[PDB]
Design a protein around this ligand. Sequence first.
Ligand SMILES: [N]C(=[N])[N][C][C][C][C]([N][C][C]C(=O)O1[C]([C]2O[C](N3[C]=NC4=C3N=[C]N=C4[N])[C]([O])[C]2[O])O1P([O])(=O)[C]P([O])(=O)OP([O])([O])=O)C([O])=O
Ligand SMILES: Nc1ncnc2c1ncn2[C@@H]1O[C@H](COP(=O)(O)CP(=O)(O)OP(=O)(O)O)[C@@H](O)[C@H]1O
Ligand SMILES: N=C(N)NCCC[C@H](NCCC(=O)O)C(=O)O
Ligand SMILES: [Mg+2]
Ligand SMILES: [Mg+2]
Lengths: 500, 490
Amino acid sequence: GAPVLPAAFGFLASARTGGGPGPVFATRGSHTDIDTPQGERSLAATLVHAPSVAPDRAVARSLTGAPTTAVLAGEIYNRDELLSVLPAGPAPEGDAELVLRLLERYDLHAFRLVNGRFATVVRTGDRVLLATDHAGSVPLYTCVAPGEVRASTEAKALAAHRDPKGFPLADARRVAGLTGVYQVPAGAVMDIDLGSGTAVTHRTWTPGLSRRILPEGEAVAAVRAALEKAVAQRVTPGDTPLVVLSGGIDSSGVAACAHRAAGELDTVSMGTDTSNEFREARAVVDHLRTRHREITIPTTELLAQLPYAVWASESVDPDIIEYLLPLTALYRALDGPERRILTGYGADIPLGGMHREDRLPALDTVLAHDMATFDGLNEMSPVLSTLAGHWTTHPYWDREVLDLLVSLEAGLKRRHGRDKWVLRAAMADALPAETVNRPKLSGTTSSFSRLLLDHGVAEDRVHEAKRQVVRELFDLTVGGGRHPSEVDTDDVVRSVADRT
Amino acid sequence: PVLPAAFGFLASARTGGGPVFATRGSHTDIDTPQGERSLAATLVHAPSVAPDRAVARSLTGAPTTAVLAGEIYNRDELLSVLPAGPAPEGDAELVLRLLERYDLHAFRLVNGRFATVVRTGDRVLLATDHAGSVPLYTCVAPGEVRASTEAKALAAHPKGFPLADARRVAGLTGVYQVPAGAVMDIDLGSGTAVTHRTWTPGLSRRILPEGEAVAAVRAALEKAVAQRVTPGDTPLVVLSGGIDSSGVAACAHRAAGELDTVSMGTDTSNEFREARAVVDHLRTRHREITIPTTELLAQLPYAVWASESVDPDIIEYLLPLTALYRALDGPERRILTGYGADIPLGGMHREDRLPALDTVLAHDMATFDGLNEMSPVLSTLAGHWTTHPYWDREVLDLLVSLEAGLKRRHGRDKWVLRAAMADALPAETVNRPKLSSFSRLLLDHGVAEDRVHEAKRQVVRELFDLTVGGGRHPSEVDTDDVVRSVADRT
Ligand SMILES: [N]C(=[N])[N][C][C][C][C]([N][C][C]C(=O)O1[C]([C]2O[C](N3[C]=NC4=C3N=[C]N=C4[N])[C]([O])[C]2[O])O1P([O])(=O)[C]P([O])(=O)OP([O])([O])=O)C([O])=O
Ligand SMILES: Nc1ncnc2c1ncn2[C@@H]1O[C@H](COP(=O)(O)CP(=O)(O)OP(=O)(O)O)[C@@H](O)[C@H]1O
Ligand SMILES: N=C(N)NCCC[C@H](NCCC(=O)O)C(=O)O
Ligand SMILES: [Mg+2]
Ligand SMILES: [Mg+2]
């Protein structure tokens, strides 16, 4: 009875003094322009959303008949908490309206209260607000100049224009490979004066730098409770969600929580002609009695996802692109209706899932560095899945779960010789023993690294070779306006190798 | 011990080459086992305490020496993450045990009121508590690291490269103040430093129903105060008629089972009547001290000398507090204050509309570092130790995080704190809302508005260059002439 997918996946909005640009998105869906009642003084916007579901809940307007409009891509998770701090009403219907009602009470500080997965733009008179969620999980880009502000959930839609009129902004980073396009920082709200094109940015969240010791038993129960809540908030009542499942504790944990929340669950696992964790996942599938699907794709197909992954994430970090190849392939391979998907992605970051020794200092060093450098990588962008029409959400990076996991002392993250111990302990009563204490996972190269090595690229120049390949795929797809389908990936890789 | 093992220090680590503090107390130079290649230091402490617990040594990793000024409050928590069972002697040793397990990240775990310097081999660590409540300064050059809890001891000296992530002390040269909530990792040989922040104000806000918010605030304050009260010893609370100090008084009384209070007044105003209500409700041993406005202003050079602050507004807040600590009679005391509660709770906010409350809150939290308004020297200059419950790391994190509607609610300021103490204080106290001698001084010497706030900055800066920069005792500074010169200079 309730909408299973967000009211809108993305948008291209515009606020200009005068004038009057068809959006090109990687995100799949209907393109619907919102009404512009105040004419040139209104906020113009094209929303990309789930076909057949009108995007009404992604737009909100003034209740006093004034020039104030808000557009929101994504969704909010702590709705009951937010509803509890609002005056008489009326009861907001949709997240854009919830945001607007909150802005009426706290102005821009409203964003310090929201725990969600969204990107939003608001125009009030000649003031424009742009805001991201705490982790910038829904990328938001902008082109600001005196008299005109353009904002979009995909940089490519802003670059599609001839020489975007975008200039430097406080806290906003210039997008490499593009001109005039800047990315709004994660956990922030930019307050823009339309006339001058100047902006003041306020951060609404930042990774904790301190660590808090809690009674052991309590810490473990707290992690389980927070994960259970975050997952429940992400599951639509009346709809059985899909969990992308691996053999690891991360995705297994989300599956256990999701099954409890929905009463039933669907799971899917992807594998290649070289490796898979089908047996490991089946252990959880049988334990939970889920409707499971196994998908095997040749390595040539997985690597064929290179341009799609770059095009969707608009990221140029080769390491990140590699993590995304498998997921990009999985989302495109799914058959049937558009799904609400939950993943165990991200757990490794605050927990130092890569740490491999009992010594704790290096774990905190890496963790702190990771939390200070995730912004701009766009690794959890919804476009990765929406390019195929599916919505994805990541429980481990829920603001409450994230704050808690980041804050725990290192001895809880690496213990008894096991990685992410606190998470394994938190779920030890909901999963089979083998899943709970099976090590995270020696000479094995990634298929992307293998691809360059198979081209005869010296192994010490492979990583830089991968960086150059991605860089060129970005220039063709995001900067050039070329569709992934039109990219001769082989030629690109061959070219980079021939110059290495 | 009722007082910390050390109030402050002047330390150094170099190759092989005393101090004068505002802090009142004994001086003890620690042993130098490794000779010229060890950590040399002069600790200033209460005559009644052994400085031993303020120094710890070990051979773990390399010859190591730690010096710590102040104290740690979440000791039980810290002890819970350590191996074996040989409990540390004091806080300096506790830090050393933590460093062995988490290295510099150990500081991300500490909730205290301290400043510490550690030398392990040719590596030097300089660390402050989350709020930098105990100022720490340093001079860093290749082969020479000097650290002090008072810039004045470092100003009295020649060399000291620029430290990027730290702030230069006003007027002084080569002297830097270690940022709050940070640990500076220095390589002695190269004189290069890397600074890691171990705490930062939360920017997000939390939503909680009244009942839970009220209960959490009460529980957090009770704990932070219990941690600050020595078992067996009755503490002293500097009490005004306000909810902040009253809230601390109620918690300290509960924790100590007894309580000593003191309120100060001037010939201009006082809150003796307001405080009396609380004095009787908790039945404490109360004392009222009235200081002439003339004596209040005479504190100008003492407050600058002790706080080493150049901020006129902060200096004015500190004049009465400084007069009070110096006027206290009897033995050295462990004192708790309700200072700082207005910052995270937006105590100065006067409207029901919330936007401005959060704007000022975020700004205040991003700019408190360097003001030194809660420095222990303000009270130790008179032998007394102060600690501030509201800026306890746990209490602070909680109060800062609360959504504005819990701070301004039912038309009352700092609502959640008032509600949290409702069942421990008289109704009038929790219900009475929150609601310049210095200025009057300058106006007497001739100076217009828009020229007074400015002139005050010049007076404060002059006193600083004299007492902190020139190593001249406050008792030797004519605050009358300082005003004179600065007066006929605008
Ligand atoms: N940083 C920033 N931004 N700011 C800062 C500011 C500060 C504030 N406050 C104000 C000033 C002061 O001083 O204050 C405090 C404390 O101290 C003490 N005292 C005072 N006075 C006095 C005292 N004692 C005794 N006597 C006299 N006279 C106390 O303890 C306190 O706590 O405070 P206040 O605020 O002023 C008062 P209260 O008490 O708190 O109450 P209410 O409620 O009215 O407020 C801050 O702190 O923040
Ligand atoms: N082959 C595959 N099949 C199904 N889902 C997959 C997958 N590879 C990755 N995922 C999803 O993408 C996320 C990224 O995660 P990874 O860290 O690489 C494995 P993990 O499932 O998190 O377990 P682990 O990190 O404890 O080993 C997972 O949480 C999972 O939901
Ligand atoms: N942003 C980063 N620093 N890293 C993102 C990596 C994504 C990571 N999965 C792979 C496991 C690993 O090798 O860390 C995760 O947290 O799901
Ligand atoms: Mg993982
Ligand atoms: Mg106060």
